[PDB]
Amino acid sequence: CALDPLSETKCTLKSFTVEKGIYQTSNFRVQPTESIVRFPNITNLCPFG
Amino acid sequence: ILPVSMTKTSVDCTMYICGDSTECSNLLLQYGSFCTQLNRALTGIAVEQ
Amino acid sequence: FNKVTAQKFNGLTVLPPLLTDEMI
Amino acid sequence: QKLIANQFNSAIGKIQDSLSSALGKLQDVVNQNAQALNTLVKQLS
Amino acid sequence: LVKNKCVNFNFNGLTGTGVLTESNKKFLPFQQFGRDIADTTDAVRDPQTLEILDITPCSFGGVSVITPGTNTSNQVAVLYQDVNC
Ligand SMILES: *[C@@H]1O[C@H](CO)[C@@H](O)[C@H](O)[C@H]1NC(C)=O
Ligand SMILES: *[C@@H]1O[C@H](CO)[C@@H](O)[C@H](O)[C@H]1NC(C)=O
Ligand SMILES: *[C@@H]1O[C@H](CO)[C@@H](O)[C@H](O)[C@H]1NC(C)=O
16 A cells, blocks of 8 residues: 555555546645744843853 | 536545644544545545536 | 635645636 | 517627626525635634 | 745744745734634744745645556556645
């Protein structure tokens, strides 16, 4: 089920044969890659140094 | 005036019920057949329309 | 056409029809 | 034949003027779908 | 700041993943968040240089496979539903 789209179509219908037409095998998702946080920058370091 | 069709919509539980969490996907395994039936019904509605 | 007149942001996609308006 | 042709042309112009003055059957089939979709998004909150 | 790319962020009120496209509408001075007809976050204000950016999900549609049938061919065609490509 994770080698070929033909194999995915075969194993998503529980049948070893396939006929003419289109088939919905799975879904397509774009995973996030980078996590960024943005916050106010005027919060300077306190002068305890 | 006689309508013959309308908008075709496809809704899946992996994008509607669950967002970007893995626990929801694990808990949806007990209700996977329900979502499969709903997706098949929506696909049949789209094909009929 | 002019007389008769997000939702897809939560995975509720819309499938375009097989026959376009020009074909109809 | 000329009278019937003129009557047909006047009827076509009459329905053209009346249609430009709204649709009920074609508007509901989109309005209920929009309401159902809006309820679907609103159920998430 | 990274724009026009599918990234995750935490803009003080939400954790949403999507691109940040440059907008064309200006917000009011006391508006920090955005909203649309539905209850989905679509606009937000950058606290760095008071910039307005849009929100757009990247996961659109699914995967469709076209098969010529049995005893005819062996290769298939892969179709994505509603994503830019
Ligand atoms: C409304 O906003 C546009 C840009 O978004 C701006 O050009 C216009 O001046 C604004 N109108 C008023 C009355 O402030
Ligand atoms: C962030 O720092 C820069 C450089 O000091 C400054 O120009 C900018 O106004 C700051 N952003 C704020 C205060 O929102
Ligand atoms: C898809 O993105 C490319 C650039 O990445 C752009 O040139 C093209 O216009 C986009 N297509 C659509 C339909 O938005």
